[PDB]
Every structure is written in C-alpha cells, then in structure tokens.
Design a protein around this ligand. Structure first.
Ligand SMILES: Cn1cc(O)c(=O)cc1C(=O)O
Ligand SMILES: [Mn+2]
Ligand SMILES: [Zn+2]
Length: 478
C-alpha cells in the first residue's frame, strides 16, 4: 500500500531544471549475456525428460493448474499431449488440401535448405559438422508449395551430397475474411494459449504484430528446420502440429542463452539474427542440458519465456504458431531485458515494449506487486525521458508539431537504427510534406542535422495524457 514512485507532477518539476536532489539514478547497468548458470549440471542431468501434460477430456484442457505448469520458470517447455483430440479441434481445417481450396494464391515464404541427417548439421560438402544452417529466402503461392509438398511425399513413397528441400514458412492467417473457419476453430482453445485474450500482453499492443498476435501457418516436408532462436522479445510461444507427420523439438533453458550466444560467436555467427543449428556434441561437452522430444499431430508445444530452441519436421506436416505473453513479472522482465539488449545490439524489437507498457498501464489492473513495480518503473523512465527531450527542444526553440495518432496506429521505429521511437518523432521536412513520415530517433536525426534544421518533431501523445495514465496506474487489490 506504499507508493515508492514520484507523482507525474514531481517528475515534471524535476525536469524543469545543478544543485537539487535527484529523483532517481537514471544510469542503469547495461544488458549483457549471462554466464553459464550456477549450480552447474553433471553429465547425467543433460538429457532431461520433457515436462508433459496428458489431456483426455475437454475439461482437462480448462483445468486451471495447466497455465501455472506451463509458465513455471523451471519448465522451459511443456508438451500438451492430445490437445486437439481433447477439444475436438478440426485439424482438417489446416490441411494442405483445405488451404488450397480456401486461398490457393496466398503467399508463402519459402526457405530452401539442405536435407540434413537426424540431429546433425554438416557443411554442404558433407565433410564436417558446422553450426551455420543454410536457409535461403524466396516466395511462392500456397498452390505451388502444396504441389511440391505432395510431390515430395509421392517421390518418397517410391522407396526413395544432400538433397535440397523447401520449407513453406510465415503463411499469414490474420485476415478473418479469408480464414474465418480456421480462426474460429482456435477460439476453442483455453484462454492461456489463445491468440487473443485479456490476459495476453500481446493483446494489449493495440495493433498487429504479424505472427505474434496473429496466426502464421507452416507447410513442411521432412527435414524442414526452424534453426536456433529465442522468441521475439522472449515472449512465450504456442505451436500446434496439424500433421500428418511428426516434428522434433530441441530445447535449452533460458538461463543458458549466454552460453549459446558464445557458441554462435565462436562459430562466426550472430546469435540474434544468424542462422544456426547447434551441434549436440558441443552442448554436451559444455554441460548444457537439452530437452528433446517429438510433437505429434494434435500436440501443442508451449515454449516458456526466453527458452532457446530449434525444430525440424520428421515427416510431412503443417504447423500453426503464434505467441502469448502471460501477465507475469517473469514474462515482463524477460521482454524488457531483451528489449534493452536488442538496442545495444542494434536489433529491432518486434514487440514495442514502451508503447505496450503504456497500454498495459491504461488497460490492466495489476495486483502482483513485483510486476506492478516493473511496469511503473518503465513508465517512470520513459515519462522522464519524454519530458527531458521536450524541455530540451523547447529550450533550443525547436517547434514541436502536434501530430497525434489514429486508431490502432502502430508504434514507430527509427528508419536508421530500428529503435522504437515513442511520442516524439523526428521526420525530415521533405518526408513530412510528402506524408511518407520516415521516422528517425533523436540520435540518428542529429547525426545528419546537429541542430535539426532538416527535421520536424511530431508529437503523438499529449503530455497531460501520459501524466494521467502514469498517476492512475496504481497497485490493484487482490
Ligand atoms: C513455426 N515455428 C515457429 C517457431 O518459433 C519454432 O520454434 C518452430 C516452428 C516450427 O514449427 O518449425
Ligand atoms: Mn520458436
Ligand atoms: Zn535511430
């Protein structure tokens, strides 16, 4: 019941300033990748069994402890067995035959890959095992990928230096007028895995983040790989295998992501943006535990926050996937941590955590003190940053044009460095007049116009609005 944060009036008065007391240490320790976790694990604990939920009845899927089992930080992944059958989900709505009938001209992002043996990844000459995973981009239609997927299967039915294969990825199932029956089928899921829910942080973004708060579909042939990654901004993820074939999952706990980052660097690969497939022998030598399991048709895979993982098709199948963000301190903490790390790495945060945090403060009554403090700390830092910049512009006599923002207007990012740009947008005079609105962050704008002569400053939010949202965000009763 104790407020530990200053009021918006106090933050503003603090910004109106050499001799006065501080309100907070604006300096913050910079993000870095963690060392190998303590305590270290012996060899006999490096192949742990996968946390599993065995569903039989529709009632089983709505059992409240399921959500807590999945979000438990000690469980890096949970496989929910029999989920589609328990809910009488019609997986046929996502079959390739149904997709071709529904939208045969829909776009498919093809990844062209080498068919690699089992859990291994070899150089293209088949000489040695390497971490780099060849996966080159092209685009086709559902109709044409479907023909390939079907012909691949017929060819193998004939009983039979790596084969080239094609993985159909990132098929956009967001348009409810093209995918009405498919999307309605997913409303049968329990709330904690649904694409849209009041308890899903990504449902509070206020705009589409494609493939995170909308569904994407994947069409596969054996060997189709999603290489090593953490989810965007460490958000939990949901994956259902449509079948008819199986998928194989490889999972490492979040706490080892620094070790994996180091493995990538040692192999001349970028952890966040590169294409890499771990060598299991390297991980075993370094005492990194690996969860490894098969996802059958109708099985749902829950990837917990920040879990490091990589996946391959064993047979022919489709999968559907999206992300969710539990309303938890752990989820928010890891999303903010990766947001900060992404800035230092100049990697775009697909989830605009500042925009989202302010929407969370508008919409959500937070009753957990630890989560509440994290969100309000973020509001404090960004409110102070905005008012500081605003005063600096006013002090230099730089006009601030009221721009406002429309319904569901997305967060904007810097066209140069790809940082989120919140509230105060820097746009060149030319881009403003032509309404291209190429946003720059402050730092990137100044690098080409130290006094901002070539730029206008557009203001999205009234400062009074932000101050009121901040003051009205208080700890909710349990
Ligand atoms: C579609 N997808 C998305 C992810 O984030 C994965 O980790 C794995 C897949 C897959 O089914 O290969
Ligand atoms: Mn994933
Ligand atoms: Zn920038």
């Amino acid at each position: 019941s104790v407020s530990i944060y200053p009021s918006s009036a106090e933050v503003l008065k603090a910004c109106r300033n050499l001799s006065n007391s501080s309100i907070l240490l604006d300096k913050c320790p910079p993000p870095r990748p963690p060392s190998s976790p303590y305590p270290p694990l012996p060899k006999d604990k490096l192949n742990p069994p996968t946390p599993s939920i065995y569903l039989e009845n529709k009632r089983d899927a709505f059992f409240p402890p399921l959500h807590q089992f999945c979000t438990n930080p000690n469980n890096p992944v949970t496989v929910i067995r029999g989920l589609a059958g328990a809910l009488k989900l019609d997986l046929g709505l996502f079959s390739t035959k149904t997709l071709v009938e529904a939208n045969n001209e829909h776009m498919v992002e093809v990844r062209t890959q080498l068919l690699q043996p089992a859990d291994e990844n070899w150089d293209p000459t088949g000489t040695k095992k390497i971490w780099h995973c060849e996966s080159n981009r092209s685009h086709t239609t559902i109709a044409k990928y479907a023909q390939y997927q079907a012909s691949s299967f017929q060819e193998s039915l004939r009983e039979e230096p790596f084969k080239t294969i094609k993985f159909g990825t990132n098929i956009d199932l967001s348009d409810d007028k093209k995918w009405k029956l498919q999307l309605h089928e997913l409303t049968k899921l329990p709330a904690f895995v649904r694409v849209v829910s009041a308890g899903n942080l990504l449902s509070h973004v206020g705009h589409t983040i494609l493939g995170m708060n909308t569904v994407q579909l994947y069409m596969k042939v054996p060997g189709s790989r999603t290489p090593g990654h953490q989810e965007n901004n460490n958000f939990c993820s949901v994956n259902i295998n449509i079948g008819p074939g199986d998928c194989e999952w490889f999972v490492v706990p979040e706490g080892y992501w620094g070790v994996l980052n180091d493995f990538c660097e040692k192999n001349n690969l970028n952890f966040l943006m590169g294409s890499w497939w771990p060598n299991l022998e390297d991980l075993y030598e370094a005492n990194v535990p690996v969860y490894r399991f098969i996802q059958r048709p109708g099985d749902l895979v829950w990837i917990n926050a920040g879990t490091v993982h990589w996946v391959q098709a064993i047979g022919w199948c489709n999968n559907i996937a999206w992300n969710v963000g539990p309303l938890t301190a752990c989820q928010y903490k890891l999303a903010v941590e990766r947001y900060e790390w992404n800035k230092l790495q100049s990697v775009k945060s697909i989830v605009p955590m500042v925009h989202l945090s302010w929407n969370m403060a508008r919409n959500i009554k937070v009753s957990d003190p630890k989560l509440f403090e994290m969100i309000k700390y973020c509001l404090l830092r960004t409110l102070k940053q905005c008012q500081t910049l605003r005063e600096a512009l006013i002090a230099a006599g730089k006009e601030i044009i009221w721009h406002g923002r429309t319904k569901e207007e997305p967060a904007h990012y810097c066209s140069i460095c790809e940082v989120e740009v919140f509230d105060l947008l820097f746009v060149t005079n030319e881009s403003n007049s032509r309404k291209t609105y190429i946003v720059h962050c402050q730092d990137c704008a100044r690098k080409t116009s130290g006094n901002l002569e070539n730029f206008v400053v557009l203001e999205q939010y009234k400062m009074e609005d932000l101050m009121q949202v901040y003051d009205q965000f208080t700890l909710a009763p349990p």
